Amino acid sequence: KHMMLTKELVKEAREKAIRMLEKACIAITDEEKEKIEVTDFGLGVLYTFGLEILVYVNNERYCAKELVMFPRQICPEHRHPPIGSYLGKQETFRCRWGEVYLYVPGTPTPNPRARIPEEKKRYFTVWHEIVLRPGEQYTIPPNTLHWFQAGDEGAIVSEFSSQSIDEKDIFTDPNVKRIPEIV
Amino acid sequence: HMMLTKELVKEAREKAIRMLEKACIAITDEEKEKIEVTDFGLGVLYTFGLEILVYVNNERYCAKELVMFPRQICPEHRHPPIGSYLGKQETFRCRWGEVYLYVPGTPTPNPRARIPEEKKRYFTVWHEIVLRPGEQYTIPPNTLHWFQAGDEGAIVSEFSSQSIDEKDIFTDPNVKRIPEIV
Ligand SMILES: OC[C@H]1O[C@](O)(CO)[C@@H](O)[C@@H]1O
Ligand SMILES: OC[C@H]1O[C@](O)(CO)[C@@H](O)[C@@H]1O
Ligand SMILES: [Mn+2]
Ligand SMILES: [Mn+2]
């Protein structure tokens, strides 16, 4: 069934993300702990498709975030398009802990590490693999299709970017709604 | 006073690497060789100095890790407009240790920072912001600021618009930003 993001699911996920941040020695304030965003992308299977996000700062000039991912959690394929005169978000990912499998346009990598549910494979169209372990980075230019899945222990991945406007992101999966609906 | 030598730089790079490791911040072997050590041209690295890792710096944004040994001071400066570029805006986030940041405003009584008496004239802003791990402050462009780490040192992340270090304006006319490693 097309399941639902509940308050209890959100609380459970927020607490798990906080433990992961603490394990990686990343200090976060009590106020920030309350502002960790939990999204299941409107797909109803948070532990399959989902992200736990801390926004450190986001303004017209720049943005920085911490993306926390549970084991094998997937961020559905999307891109950050131009918005009016804004070029669109460019971002640099830096893995801080665990490992993540990032996919961008290019020649399909053989034997990719990511495992996508069979019924959703149609909504993953780019297959050039970049594996990031702690300390490693990759930069995604604006309006570029990408998606990612954490490894079997999960991941913490920093974002450094231009202004973020999540509401304007374009997803390949037409079922995705970026902004959560918590019951 | 001294000149910044290759040996002093390598010693400071190694100490900054150990501090990053203590804070559990992963860095690549390539990044270890690219940590910048500056004494701002003032010849007292352990008084005025910074060890910097630039994670990324382009036209759209910049992120750095600033490592500071106990009581290292960044001399007072601002990031000005450059042509049509507004100038760098930056957000600092303390990751480890503690740092004393000073910005324009009413002088704070009993500041935590300790500055050399003979350099006081080149520190002109005195409104104090203390940042402990997890805490942040944002400096608008063309704003005078300086900072000193606490008695354990500090690791302070920067999130900012494009960085152009060469165009920074320092209050101390003795400061030279761009290195002279002999
Ligand atoms: O909106 C989808 C998510 O994608 C990211 O850029 C990672 O690609 C996050 O900043 C964002 O919240
Ligand atoms: O150049 C002076 C230094 O000041 C900072 O913005 C911190 O204020 C660093 O990015 C820079 O390297
Ligand atoms: Mn993205
Ligand atoms: Mn600055």
Residue numbers in the entry:
A (entry chain AAA): -2 to 180
B (entry chain BBB): -1 to 180
Question: What did the study's authors say about this model?
Answer:
The conserved manganese binding site is located within this pocket and is co-ordinated by the side chains of residues H75, H77, H143, and E88.
It was possible to trap the slowly reacting sugar substrates, mannose and fructose in the TsLI active site due to their reduced turnover rates. The loop containing R175 in TsLI does not appear to change conformation between the non-ligated TsLI structure and the structures of TsLI sugar complexes. The TsLI shows an unusually high specificity for D-lyxose in comparison to D-mannose. This high specificity has enabled the slowly reacting substrates D-mannose and D-fructose to be trapped in the active site of TsLI in crystal complexes.
